[PDB]
A paper describes a structure:
Aerolysin is a major contributor to the pathogenicity of Aeromonas spp, which causes gastroenteritis, deep wound infections and sepsis in humans. It is a pore-forming toxin (PFT), which is secreted by the bacterium as a water-soluble protein, binds receptors on their target cell membrane and, following proteolytic activation, forms circular heptameric oligomers that insert into the plasma membrane thus permeabilizing it, potentially leading to cell death. Aerolysin belongs to the family of β-PFTs, meaning that the final pore spans the membrane in the form of a β-barrel and defines the aerolysin-like family of proteins that share a common structural motif3. Combined, these structures, consistent with the recent lysenin pore structure, describe the major steps involved in the pore-formation process by aerolysin: the transition from the monomer to the oligomer with the formation of two highly stable concentric β-barrels, the zipper-like formation of the β-barrel and the final piston-like puncturing of the lipid bilayer.
To verify that the quasipore conformation is indeed representative of the full pore conformation, we analysed the structure of wild-type aerolysin heptamers. If performed at sufficiently low aerolysin concentration, it allowed us to reduce aggregation and to obtain relatively well-dispersed individual pores in detergent micelles. Cryo-EM analysis led to a 7.9 Å resolution map of the wild-type pore. Most interestingly, the nine amino acids at the tip of each β-hairpins adopt a different conformation than in anthrax protective antigen and fold sideways in a rivet-like fashion, confirming our previous experimental conclusions. Once in the membrane, each loop formed by nine amino acids at the tip of the inner β-barrel folds sideways and lies approximately parallel to the membrane plane, leading to a rivet-like anchoring.
Author numbering:
A (entry chain C), B (entry chain D): 2 to 424
C (entry chain B): 266 to 318
The structure:
């Protein structure tokens, strides 16, 4: 049962090994401590363990061995959750894609103030005068050409320096998924149509008894192929020549030549073909003559689309962290800028919520982001939870719209009147 | 809730921050203003905001900061729609394709006057004497060889200059789609027919008990293939030669040669094949002998076609805008001519109605057309709506016609009499 | 000469056939697309253990 770093600090009142009246500190959790020992322990500082052993701070190489000292047994006795307080989805007023996206990007309470605050906790640098932990006095929120948030340059002041830098938040290339029945596409319209091909046929059934269906099967297949090959060839030739020459016609210059040829080659390539292959088969239980018509065509298609509520959010932040100026531990301080991943949408290795959980459990997997735990030393990591919740929660609002694409193949089958036949 | 530029101008009577008695102006909408600040604000002019802040006109770089001033809080309190007044479809007298298209192109009330007026609002240049905002005194409406609208050259006068230019409106390459049951194709006629192939067969079932069906499956496949390849070859050869020569027949000129060959190539290509593959299978539960005949043929097909109401309209205008001479803002004034897209039919990025909506919401997406909002400064954008409606509304009239195409494959299956068989 | 080689092709081949016993006009739409998919997964009890010392 892994112990979270939050409460892990020293219990001042406690004695430890001599009888704390709490649940024992053990070896299993003790080994798990090594990566954040600096948070908990002073260089020389010593801490105990229930099996009659002790831990030492960063000053020493120390293995887990015998000693006497206090520590937290208290926290392990009653662990606390660590969870996000509320997952609830946000409801924003509905509209069209332009406006809905804007409202989301515009929202001070729902987007900006919380995103900025989260940024503040996470390491982002500050700019100029301040009002609270988020968006400063001079700071402002305007739109980038891309639709992202941006501010004016003139005032400057990042980290209290005259440089031009400003924080920006990207709008995502939105992607959505919808579990419910709540959305729909309307009737199609063909802007333009060209007719590629037609095929017609019929079944003639004069006789009374034998009645059977007819099958027309088509295939329209077009394909492209691409390949490249590289060949290496080596030629070895040894030759000898004599000048005796044979009187009739040996040849004055008589040469014999042997050539050995070796060549090898490797290649790769591939092709893709698309086929439109319709099959029509009328059962036609009637004594008749039945025309059938099968059509292939190309067209421009457009559909109006009914409003859909859900949207997924992809966020990566700006590169301000390098300016950040906070106690790092995991990373060295470096000038060159690095964009930090915020992924809200579910990508397991990328997503922030998981990383938050992972930091609590402690897992040594591969990582490329600044960790969550250093906030505990710096800010305490309390009462922040709602702020994180603001960023993490799903947001939805109905956006009505269009469905359109490049011109596509389409097809059709028409059936005629089964004309009465007689013998 | 984005605020439209229409009403956005200053409220003269209002004080602003000191207590307007209206709903507050806020930062979110304020940032959205930057692209049309020039319309609303004078260079030095100042405007307020509810969170104790102020905005400044184009003279300044100004960020959103503290100040005191009036603005519109009034409009935001009660927003107005911005919509097209009526979507209703136009009914034009029915006919054939030649006449129906003509009537549409001919209609003064429904086509010309409104299209010209819309053009006038949008930036199109004027020619000679005028009568109202649309089609001038000298101006006229005649037909181009293409079927487009055109006028005579002699009089001239575009922008009050002697040049030859005249406005023209294109007839679209019509494309239509039809949701309803309301249309049909009649009986087919074969103008010409050539018989490609025939295959015949039968099932003989003398014995009383075993009765089973027969399946004939065919495939006629023809295909074409095209490809091109490019190969690059590099040859490196080093050679040495000696003149010692070997007495018997070394060769006076003794050479040894080594050649290294390297070659590589890439290619692309593709092929398409069409197959006509019919399958016929009579169940034939009878003790009999049953002939079956399967035919492949080629033919010219023609169908009369029942009237269809709907038509979609594709419009792009003339290139007159460059002559236009109005306050641009978004575009610089340039002499070279550019054709401006009017798309009535639904193509999302192209269509005018969407662009009208987009201009109202404010979206920074990529754009290649003159924007809708400058009309507000120039004309006020009032009472225009019906005119826009005239252009935008769907129009329909039944056009009867023909369905024809190039010669096509067709096929047929005939079944014989199941002749009574006996053991 | 001697040679070896091979190729792999993947095909997505859907077939749709409405029975449609009605006197009508019936539109059908078939779509191909590419996407990123993710599923939450319910707890599973068993695990197999591979050990080499």
């Amino acid at each position: 049962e892994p112990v979270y770093p939050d409460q892990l600090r020293l219990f001042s009142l406690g004695q430890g090994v001599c009888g704390d009246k709490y649940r024992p500190v053990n070896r299993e959790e003790a080994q798990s401590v090594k990566s954040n020992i600096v948070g908990m322990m002073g260089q020389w500082q010593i801490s105990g363990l229930a099996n009659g052993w002790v831990i030492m701070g960063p000053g020493y190489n120390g293995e887990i061995k015998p000693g006497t000292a206090s520590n937290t047994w208290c926290y392990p006795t009653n662990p606390v959750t660590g969870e996000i307080p509320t997952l609830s989805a946000l409801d924003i007023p509905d509209g069209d894609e332009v406006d809905v996206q804007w409202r989301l990007v515009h929202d001070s309470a729902n987007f900006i103030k919380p995103t900025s605050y989260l940024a503040h906790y996470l390491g982002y640098a500050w700019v100029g005068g301040n009002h609270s932990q988020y968006v400063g006095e001079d700071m402002d929120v305007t739109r980038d050409g891309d639709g992202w948030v941006i501010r004016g340059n003139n005032d400057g002041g990042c980290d209290g320096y005259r440089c031009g830098d400003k924080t920006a938040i990207k709008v995502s290339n939105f992607a959505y998924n919808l579990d419910p029945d709540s959305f729909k596409h309307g009737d199609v319209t063909q802007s333009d149509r060209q007719l590629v091909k037609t095929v017609v046929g019929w079944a003639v059934n004069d006789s009374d008894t034998p009645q059977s269906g007819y099958d027309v099967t088509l295939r329209y297949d077009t394909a492209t192929n691409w390949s490249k090959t590289n060949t290496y060839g080596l030629s070895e030739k040894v030759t000898t020549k004599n000048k005796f020459k044979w009187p009739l016609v040996g040849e004055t210059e008589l040469s014999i030549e042997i050539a050995a040829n070796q060549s090898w080659a490797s290649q790769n390539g591939g092709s893709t073909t698309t086929s439109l292959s319709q099959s029509v088969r009328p059962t036609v239980p009637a004594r008749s003559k039945i025309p059938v018509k099968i059509e292939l065509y190309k067209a421009d298609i457009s559909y109006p689309y009914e409003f859909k509520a859900d949207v997924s959010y992809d966020l990566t932040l700006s590169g301000f962290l390098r300016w950040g100026g906070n106690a790092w531990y995991t990373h060295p301080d470096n000038r060159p800028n690095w964009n930090h991943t915020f992924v809200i949408g579910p990508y397991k290795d990328k997503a922030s919520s998981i990383r938050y959980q992972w930091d609590k459990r402690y897992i040594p997997g591969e990582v490329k982001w600044w960790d969550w735990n250093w906030t505990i030393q710096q800010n305490g990591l309390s009462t922040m939870q709602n702020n994180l919740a603001r960023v993490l929660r799903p947001v939805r609002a109905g956006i009505t719209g269009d469905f359109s694409a490049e011109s596509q193949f389409a097809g059709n089958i028409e059936i005629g009147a089964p004309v009465p036949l007689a013998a």
